[PDB]
Amino acid sequence: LKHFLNTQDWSRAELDALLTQAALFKRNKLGSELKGKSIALVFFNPSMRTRTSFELGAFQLGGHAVVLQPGKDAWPIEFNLGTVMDGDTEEHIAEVARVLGRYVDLIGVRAFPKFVDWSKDREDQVLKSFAKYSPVPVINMETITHPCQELAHALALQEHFGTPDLRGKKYVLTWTYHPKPLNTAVANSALTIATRMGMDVTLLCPTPDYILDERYMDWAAQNVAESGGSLQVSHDIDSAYAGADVVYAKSWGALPFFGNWEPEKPIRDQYQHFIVDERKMALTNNGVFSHCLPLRRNVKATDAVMDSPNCIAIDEAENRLHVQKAIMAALV
Amino acid sequence: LKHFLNTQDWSRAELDALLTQAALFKRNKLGSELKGKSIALVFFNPSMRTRTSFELGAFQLGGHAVVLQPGKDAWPIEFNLGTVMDGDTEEHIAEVARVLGRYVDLIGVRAFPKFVDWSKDREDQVLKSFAKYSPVPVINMETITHPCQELAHALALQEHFGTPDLRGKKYVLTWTYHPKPLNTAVANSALTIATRMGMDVTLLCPTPDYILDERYMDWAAQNVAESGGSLQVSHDIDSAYAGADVVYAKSWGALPFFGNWEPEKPIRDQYQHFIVDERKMALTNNGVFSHCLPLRRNVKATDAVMDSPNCIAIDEAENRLHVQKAIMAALV
Amino acid sequence: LKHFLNTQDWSRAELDALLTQAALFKRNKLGSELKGKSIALVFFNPSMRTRTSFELGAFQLGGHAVVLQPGKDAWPIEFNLGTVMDGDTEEHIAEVARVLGRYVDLIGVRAFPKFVDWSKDREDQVLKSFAKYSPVPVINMETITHPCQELAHALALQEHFGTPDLRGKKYVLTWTYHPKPLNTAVANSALTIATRMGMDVTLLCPTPDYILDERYMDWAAQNVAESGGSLQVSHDIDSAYAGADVVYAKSWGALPFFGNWEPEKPIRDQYQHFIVDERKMALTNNGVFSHCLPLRRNVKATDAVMDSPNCIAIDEAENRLHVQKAIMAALV
């Protein structure tokens, strides 16, 4: 059975096919690729943009999405094995996935890390459990990676540059400020897709403590070796932005501080200057800027940058609809 | 771009067209006016009747409604301008509306006042912000006015009297008791539509403190001058009910007491006798009674009045479905 | 007007027709039996499996389900009669049902007992009120009985044995352990349908305190007299399981302890050995095992029993979809 858990699991040819199908759906949004079919959108964490895009995507192709929210509509689910369920959990994931598989044709899963222990969050237990027990294809709607965002982002860039071939372009994945420590998911995904596309990627962050998990740094390294781009880590803003063709910002909590965020606060507060502003973008090669959203204005990026004609965040946002339709259509 | 924010913004001819289209949908509810189209129902405050009627209305015309609840599915949204978003708000309304506009064809918005400061609530910030930033038509699902209720009410009255011409009929908008101070929205709307229809309207309330906002009193005055009816405020129950053809009740908190409801409590408790009962209706010209619902029995109106053959509240309730379909069809 | 409140209200011929229609829908799931029709799924208590199955069932037959959750989307509803609604309740059930009846073609209701007083919970007030005031058919989505589960269960058994005639088969409805006292609904329903099908039923429970309400014990007695089976209560595990063809487990709080669960805790904790394990099933006649779900593994039943090829719980779960479609189609 084929699932859409990560772009890294798919071949370049398969990804290219998805992006092209996404482009086709953008030119003709109504169809019957999902006629009479259904997808269960399982939200362990809520998301209006994800619910909206998937729900409409199913509708437009003749299918139907069922929105489920485990944290609000049911007792906790047990994912561990060989336990005596005499605690808080009422049902095991094996039963949840097997039953859903008798009702729907696809299962989408969104489940964020708990931020107490990265060794546990990085195992992607919720998503992997659904993939293990489900008799139908599973789709990652964001856990510790955000593959749907990757393709929406990739498509937006190809559309902006007028070509699917982005090799050679200088790509800057920059950490930006936020009052709280966030999920590294979007950054892990950006690094992954940018290198898979063969761009010359620079991971710009305040200190070595903010470097992403080795797993993704390795995915990126492997992608560069295969696509012909490059991977570099930098803690210097000006040299990173210089000549950049693309600047993608995202804030995230330093991994070494999981379960110990108190001391991480004064650290991030020293880098509020990582905010994407006009000065920094002026250093780029008339590059574009984007963010996965939601974005705190004048904190992650200034109003001037956000409303600049070079900001493609709304186009990338729209593309979530098109790429997800391509993903669902491919899996059924 | 045309929106449905208030009936006052539409011409009499346009409103008449909406009501007539509503009558047509009532005679033939299934159609394709919204085939493949969608509407995002954004609830900042929940409403089962509104979600049900809009959702079914979209379905019956071949479209699809996406139900969103910002207060429960996402962090707070920022509506103010030029601020540094380092507080509770995670995303700005500009981004929320622009992205939704790339997904749906229509956006419905329900957002109640906060009851702390009327000078702030009366600005209709949430609704006006959506209207400002959305690239698609916006529909008021109740904020400080309830235009959808206005048309459902107007249609019910025309159906009851067997004519679209209600000029001359004596219309009594009466305040009624409730243990808590409520939104003036429905009353503002009733006054607006009743006068727009040229009826002889009387605003019956306990004291001058309960008179509606000047904005609506002026809308009403303007409507009478143009339609040929009349507007009058009264604090005397018997003279108001005398000869009435229509009695519409609604409870609301005295505007001068926003952010200071403690002293307003003993005041409203002195007017529990404003309850619509048989004695009062016996003074009318065999007039009809209605309420927007939900209604507390034997508090706002007695069981006898509510179950009287002259109570058309259920018919007005049904009409929410028909008028909203007319509104959505007109805006796409 | 015909409703689906309990299987006991339907004739054997009618039930047989429902089960056969369910079998037909399983062979051809897409249809137009509900084309343009709708059902309001009213959840006073949430259920992902019920929302999913009903919602998809409506969709597959050309209809649409509207999901409503009174406890989270509105103030409390008043069910009592002749009261002055100056308390917590904002709207009366008469208005709720009458209005919904102007919007939808069917109304599903799920409302659990409150566990404080069984004399009150056993009156099925919420469901009976909807049935009384609704102008459209009402469907029990679980209150103090679970008729939809009954038919899904009945169908699974017929499919397992390869025949609709289960007379003579030894049916064991066994209480099982759970750390908390639960609803007797599923057990009441199992006893009801098993006897209606003419099986030789044994109600296995720890003590006389766990015997089900007299109402259902009488339904069962009447069913046996008419179908030709038998009804027996047992507190001895081994004699009950011996030669059993079917074992259906369910945990429930002892009725005599409603509103006084403290002393019931040490009592149930003495019967953890009621867990369905391999030893017990080894005593049966190669019988099947099932549970309505959700099931706590290694508490209600061991992993070995749950994953045994003789466990049909997932098939019974799937059948909720098919039988509910048969029910909705029959009522419209």
Ligand SMILES: CC(=O)N[C@@H](CCCN)C(=O)O
């Ligand atoms: C603010 C926040 O927690 N953002 C989320 C979601 C981003 C995609 N919509 C994150 O950091 O992954």
Ligand SMILES: CC(=O)N[C@@H](CCCN)C(=O)O
């Ligand atoms: C009780 C209450 O707050 N009623 C609301 C909603 C009325 C329309 N359904 C109000 O006063 O506007």
Ligand SMILES: CC(=O)N[C@@H](CCCN)C(=O)O
């Ligand atoms: C654990 C619990 O409360 N179970 C519920 C629902 C069973 C049907 N899904 C009950 O005892 O009725």
